[PDB]
Each structure stands twice: as structure tokens, then as C-alpha cells.
Amino acid sequence: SSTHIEQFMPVKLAQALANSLFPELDSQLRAGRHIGIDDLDNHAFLMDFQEQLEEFYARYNVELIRAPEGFFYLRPRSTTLIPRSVLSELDMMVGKILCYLYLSPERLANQGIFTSQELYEELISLADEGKLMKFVNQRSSGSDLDKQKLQEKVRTTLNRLRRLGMVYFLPNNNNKFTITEAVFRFGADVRSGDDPREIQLRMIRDGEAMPV
Amino acid sequence: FMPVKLAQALANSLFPELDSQLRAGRHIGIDDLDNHAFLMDFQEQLEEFYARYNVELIRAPEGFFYLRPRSTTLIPRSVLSELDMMVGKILCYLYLSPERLANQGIFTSQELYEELISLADEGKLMKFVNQRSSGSDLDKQKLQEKVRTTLNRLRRLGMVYFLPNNNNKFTITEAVFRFGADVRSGDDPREIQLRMIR
Amino acid sequence: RIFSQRLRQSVQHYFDNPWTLTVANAERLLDMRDEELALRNEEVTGELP
Amino acid sequence: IERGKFRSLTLVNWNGFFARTFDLDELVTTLSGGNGAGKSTTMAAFVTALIPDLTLLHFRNTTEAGATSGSRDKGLHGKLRAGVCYSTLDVINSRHQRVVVGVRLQQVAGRDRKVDIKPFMIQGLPTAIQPTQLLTENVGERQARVLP
Amino acid sequence: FIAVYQHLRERIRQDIIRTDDPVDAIEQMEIELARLTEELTAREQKLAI
Numbered sequence: 001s002s003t004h005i006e007q008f009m010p011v012k013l014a015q016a017l018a019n020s021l022f023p024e025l026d027s028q029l030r031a032g033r034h035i036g037i038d039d040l041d042n043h044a045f046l047m048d049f050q051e052q053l054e055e056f057y058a059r060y061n062v063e064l065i066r067a068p069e070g071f072f073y074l075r076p077r078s079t080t081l082i083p084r085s086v087l088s089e090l091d092m093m094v095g096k097i098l099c100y101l102y103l104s105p106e107r108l109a110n111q112g113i114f115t116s117q118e119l120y121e122e123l124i125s126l127a128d129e130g131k132l133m134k135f136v137n138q139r140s141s142g143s144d145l146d147k148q149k150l151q152e153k154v155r156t157t158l159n160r161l162r163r164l165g166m167v168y169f170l171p172n173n174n175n176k177f178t179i180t181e182a183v184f185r186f187g188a189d190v191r192s193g194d195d196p197r198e199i200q201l202r203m204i205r206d207g208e209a210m211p212v
Numbered sequence: 213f214m215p216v217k218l219a220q221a222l223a224n225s226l227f228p229e230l231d232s233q234l235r236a237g238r239h240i241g242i243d244d245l246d247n248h249a250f251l252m253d254f255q256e257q258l259e260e261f262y263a264r265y266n267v268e269l270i271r272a273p274e275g276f277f278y279l280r281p282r283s284t285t286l287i288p289r290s291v292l293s294e295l296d297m298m299v300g301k302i303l304c305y306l307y308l309s310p311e312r313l314a315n316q317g318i319f320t321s322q323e324l325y326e327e328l329i330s331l332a333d334e335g336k337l338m339k340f341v342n343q344r345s346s347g348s349d350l351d352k353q354k355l356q357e358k359v360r361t362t363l364n365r366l367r368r369l370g371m372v373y374f375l376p377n378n379n380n381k382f383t384i385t386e387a388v389f390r391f392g393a394d395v396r397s398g399d400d401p402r403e404i405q406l407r408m409i410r
Numbered sequence: 411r412i413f414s415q416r417l418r419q420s421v422q423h424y425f426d427n428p429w430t431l432t433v434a435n436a437e438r439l440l441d442m443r444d445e446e447l448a449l450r451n452e453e454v455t456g457e458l459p
Numbered sequence: 460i461e462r463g464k465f466r467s468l469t470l471v472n473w474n475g476f477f478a479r480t481f482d483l484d485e486l487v488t489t490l491s492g493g494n495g496a497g498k499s500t501t502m503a504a505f506v507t508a509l510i511p512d513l514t515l516l517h518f519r520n521t522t523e524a525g526a527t528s529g530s531r532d533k534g535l536h537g538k539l540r541a542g543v544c545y546s547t548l549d550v551i552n553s554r555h556q557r558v559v560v561g562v563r564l565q566q567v568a569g570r571d572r573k574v575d576i577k578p579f580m581i582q583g584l585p586t587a588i589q590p591t592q593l594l595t596e597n598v599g600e601r602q603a604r605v606l607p
Numbered sequence: 608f609i610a611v612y613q614h615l616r617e618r619i620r621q622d623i624i625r626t627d628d629p630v631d632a633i634e635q636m637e638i639e640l641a642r643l644t645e646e647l648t649a650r651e652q653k654l655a656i
């Protein structure tokens with residue numbers, strides 16, 4: 001009959017949009033936040049109405065995507081109604097290191113709690129320290145002032161990742177934090193044992209990643 | 213459940229776009245025929261929809277629509293520069309009576325440049341560029357640059373419409389009144405606008 | 411012993427093919443800068459009832 | 460136990476009231492007068508004084524009651540005059556303590572019809588002091604002035 | 608067919624399941640399922656008391 005919700009919208013979609021959780025979630029999602037398993041409320045909500053949300057957001061020319069690890073996020077198309085941006089290479093270095101830290105069974109005994117110093121120590125253990133220092137300053141040659149500047153840039157970028165939902169600080173101590181599964185997106189270039197060039201091409205074609 | 217007319221409104225094809233614009237802070241004037249008509253038709257429900265975000269949907273007395281965030285806003289907030297307000301107030305002044313005969317609604321960047329320069333105090337100008345600056349060519353150039361920049365910002369707001377060509381000539385919309393002064397019985401708009409500018 | 415090689419070599423050689431992820435970065439809501447609050451002072455007077 | 464009571468309500472520099480004090484009753488207080496006399500305004504001043512939360516305050520007409528309107532104007536600004544304004548309550552505590560609660564109201568200059576609120580409280584005031592006199596200064600020949 | 612396999616290979620979740628062979632991955636997944644079921648049984652027993 002006329003004047004009936006079904007004329008304009010599916011009942012389940014209207015039911016979802018009327019929920020008290022939606023505005024928060026919407027706001028966040030648009031801002032680029034990733035949603036993992038720990039924030040139950042949100043995650044559960046997402047799960048319950050997945051297809052309706054996907055269909056909804058489609059209107060905007062944006063894909064609501066679900067990674068295999070169980071985390072949701074937004075990927076805009078070329079014709080997107082919502083702006084799209086890219087992360088910095090330092091963010092990538094910290095991202096891939098946070099990923100290796102999550103996997104490491106050697107540190108699993110910490111129960112997920114890591115310290116900025118441990119992250120920094122792992123990073124310098126693997127990457128080329130003196131060549132990476134070039135991004136901090138063109139004249140960097142291992143001076144302590146420059147080493148402290150690097151540490152502060154790391155602290156800063158880490159704080160940005162926290163806002164993206166990739167890491168959670170402790171309630172009372174800011175020198176310590178916990179990881180989430182959303183970090184696995186930094187491994188998108190190697191999860192399949194194939195030619196790196198072809199993988200990279202595939203990713204840029206899918207809109208996952210841009211070059212610099 | 214959900215009110216039937218609200219579901220109808222947000223089902224409309226025009227909603228996503230307008231939503232996007234609104235959230236950005238854009239002002240909808242009488243110029244945007246379809247968007248303005250849509251808001252006129254579904255205001256009673258859109259106000260409720262956006263109240264869920266702790267954001268207010270206001271229709272100005274002149275006729276244009278816009279969003280005002282509360283302290284508790286669910287939408288990330290951003291704020292304008294001093295220079296921004298300066299310029300805005302300027303444009304509000306230029307929405308004058310002799311304007312009709314002077315320019316037929318179409319201005320140029322130079323009009324605003326020179327008006328800005330002429331009407332403002334030096335000190336605040338300096339404050340806008342850098343306090344150490346002193347009446348130098350380069351300073352003026354940078355000021356010009358900033359002017360252009362801010363103007364573009366404003367165009368994003370919908371305050372000013374650029375004529376479709378590469379040159380910098382534009383027309384002022386009614387929504388610029390948001391910058392304007394308080395009006396009291398019998399007060400002359402020119403005088404009160406200048407009084408705030410001073 | 412599957413990912414150790416897989417991921418370490420990626421970090422070690424990243425700069426030969428630097429790549430960056432994409433994220434939704436919706437615009438912030440522009441608002442008026444709050445000017446210093448200016449109240450109305452008039453020293454009103456009147457006859458007391 | 461003796462329950463507390465509201466003794467009186469005072470208005471200063473409201474729309475139509477310069478300085479007026481209503482003495483409340485123990486059970487019922489009635490306001491009468493033709494349309495536009497100022498009864499609803501007195502109600503609004505009381506409530507304002509009670510709950511200064513500006514987010515909440517919304518004085519619709521009695522007609523259009525119950526319609527959630529989101530009106531552009533909450534209707535408080537117009538009930539105030541230029542300059543400083545007050546609204547205060549005198550209360551007798553169950554402890555037989557005299558306490559004076561209130562608010563300082565003031566219009567905001569600018570295109571938006573906004574209002575400023577500053578709560579305050581007074582304890583231990585002597586019983587002989589009236590709020591009307593406490594809030595005003597006698598300047599000139601019986602031509603008092605309000606003080607910030 | 609190749610395409611199918613390629614498609615699937617990316618979709619693996621974490622390190623303990625990194626058998627690059629999808630079909631091989633299946634069983635691991637199912638193992639997880641059983642594990643999870645036991646944990647759920649114990650937790651609901653705790654909830655009752």
C-alpha cells in the first residue's frame with residue numbers, strides 16, 4: 001500500500017539507519033577509521049547489517065570493505081563523492097614494523113602491550129638507520145639531536161595511526177600501547193608469494209595503493 | 213521504525229551529494245534551484261536527521277540554508293582564519309546599492325584587493341602576513357597570494373561564485389550576509405558594516 | 411617459516427618500489443572563528459516601583 | 460520535618476519590567492491580566508533561573524505545543540532589554556537557611572541573537588535585605604541604576 | 608582456474624594459516640572452528656554459575 005516504508009527503502013536498511021550507533025560509526029568511517037574485533041558494539045553492528053551498509057555507501061561511489069582478518073574500512077572509487085588521501089612513507093615504515101610486531105610470537109608474552117622504545121629498537125634493527133635518517137634531515141649523520149628528532153617524528157606518526165584505529169594507548173600510560181589486526185593492510189604487497197610487480201599493479205588497479 | 217517522509221527524503225537521488233556538501237559547510241542559496249527546493253520541501257525531517265549528529269540545520273532569514281555545529285558535534289570541526297573573516301566582511305560591504313550600477317553583479321579580484329588594502333589598518337595587515345614585515349613589495353605579493361587563497365576557500369563555502377573562465381572575476385551571493393553586522397531599527401547598513409570593519 | 415622472509419625482505423627493500431595505501435579523508439566542517447565576546451553595556455536607569 | 464519553600468522571584472531589566480519582585484504563596488500563586496500583559500514572560504524568567512542550560516531552553520508559544528520544531532530562535536533573547544539583566548530566587552531551606560540563587564543575563568552584540576548567562580549564589584544574607592535594593596544603586600532623585 | 612587460485616591466495620588471514628595452498632588452508636580453518644567451539648562451551652558453562 002501507499003505511504004509504506006517498503007516503497008522507498010528496505011526495512012532492514014531503515015532499521016539500521018535508525019539505530020543509535022549509526023551516527024558515531026558513520027562519522028568515524030568517513031574519517032578513515034578501521035574497525036576491528038575489539039570494539040564489540042561497532043563490530044557487531046557492522047556484521048548485523050553488512051549488506052545494507054554496503055548498498056547504502058555505494059550511492060557515494062565508495063566500497064565498504066571487509067578484510068579477511070575481520071576488519072571493515074572504506075575504499076573510495078575514482079569517481080568518489082568523498083575525498084581520498086594517501087599515507088606517508090614514514091607511516092609505512094612504522095606500519096610494516098607494527099605488523100611484524102603483531103606476528104612475533106617471541107613478544108606474545110607481553111599480552112599485546114608494547115613500548116615506543118621497543119618499536120623504535122625493532123625498526124632500527126631491520127631498516128637502514130643512516131639512510132632512513134635522510135627523511136628526518138638531509139644532513140643527518142647519526143647525531144643524537146637528529147636521533148631524538150627521529151624518535152619524536154615516530155611518536156607523532158604513531159599518534160596518527162592511533163586515530164586511524166590501528167593501535168590503542170593504555171588508559172593511564174601513554175608510553176605503552178596495544179596492537180589490533182587492522183595493521184595487516186601494510187602486508188598487502190606480500191601476502192601472496194608472487195612477482196612483486198604484478199602484485200603492485202593489481203593493487204593500484206583495485207585502488208588500494210598509489211606510488212609516490 | 214522511521215518516519216515515512218524522512219525515508220522518502222533520504223531515498224531521493226539528490227541526498228548524497230547535498231549531504232556531502234553540507235557536511236563540508238557549504239551554504240545553499242536560492243541560486244541552487246533543485247537543492248534549495250529539496251530543502252524547502254523536507255526541512256521538517258532533515259532538521260531531525262541532523263540533530264542526531266549534535267549539529268543544527270538553520271535557514272537564515274535571507275533564505276539560505278547551512279549547518280551549525282554544537283560543542284558536542286559528531287562531525288569534526290574546523291575554523292576560519294582572521295584574514296578570512298576580514299575578507300568576508302569586505303564582501304558583505306561590497307553587497308551595496310551602487311554595486312548594481314558599478315559592476316552589474318560581477319566583480320574582479322582587483323576590486324577586492326584594492327578595497328582590502330584601502331580600508332584596513334596597516335597593523336592588522338602585518339599581523340596577517342608576518343609581524344616583522346614592513347611595507348615591502350614581497351609582502352604585498354604574498355598578501356595577494358593569500359587573498360586568492362582565501363577567496364577560493366570562500367568559493368568552497370559557496371559565498372562567492374567564480375565566472376566560468378580562468379580569469380579571477382566573480383559575483384557575490386546573498387549568503388555573504390552571514391558576515392554582516394547586527395541591524396537595529398533605522399540603522400544604515402553602510403555605517404554599521406564600516407563600524408565593525410573599523 | 412613462511413612470512414619471516416616474505417615480510418623482512420619487503421621492509422629491507424621498500425625504497426626500490428615505494429608504495430602508499432589509500433584512506434577515506436572526508437572534509438572537516440568549516441566554522442566561523444569565534445570573535446571575542448562583545449556584550450551590550452548601557453548603564454540602564456529607571457524609576458523604582 | 461518542615462519542607463523547604465520558595466519565597467519570592469525578582470526580575471530586573473526584562474522586557475516591560477525594570478525591577479519587580481513577586482512574593483510567592485505557600486500553596487498557589489496566580490497571574491492575571493489581558494493578552495500580552497507579561498504572564499508567560501514571568502514563567503520563563505523563573506524557569507531560566509532554575510535551569511540555565513542554554514541548550515535546553517526553548518520557549519515556544521502555547522499554541523504549537525508539543526511540536527518539535529527546531530525553530531531558528533529559542534524565544535529568550537527578545538524577552539531581554541539592552542544592558543545587564545538579572546533573575547533571582549529566594550528560598551528558605553528545611554534548615555531555616557535563607558539562600559539566594561540566580562543568574563546574570565546579557566544580550567550578545569552581533570547578528571546572531573545570542574545570550575550570555577552567569578550563575579551565582581548568596582548565603583547568609585540578612586533577613587532585612589531585599590534583592591530589589593541589593594541589585595540596584597540609588598543614583599539621583601529616586602532614579603536608581605542597575606549595577607554589574 | 609588459475610585465476611580462481613590466484614584470487615583465493617590473497618584471502619588468507621594470519622601466519623599460522625599461511626599454507627599458500629587454499630585447499631590446505633581449509634582444514635586449518637576448520638580446526639580453528641573446533642577450537643573455538645570448545646572455548647565457547649567452557650565460557651557458557653562459566654556464565655551459568
Ligand SMILES: Nc1ncnc2c1ncn2[C@@H]1O[C@H](COP(=O)(O)OP(=O)(O)OP(=O)(O)O)[C@@H](O)[C@H]1O
Nearest residue numbers: 493494495496497498499500501534535536537538
Ligand atoms: N521574544 C519576544 N520578542 C518580542 N516581544 C516578545 C517576545 N516574547 C514576548 N513578547 C511580547 O511581550 C509581551 C508579553 O508577552 P507574554 O506572552 O509574556 O504575555 P501574557 O500576558 O502571558 O500573554 P498571553 O496570556 O496572551 O500568553 C507581549 O507583547 C509579547 O508580544
Ligand SMILES: [Mg+2]
Nearest residue numbers: 495498499500
Ligand atoms: Mg503569554
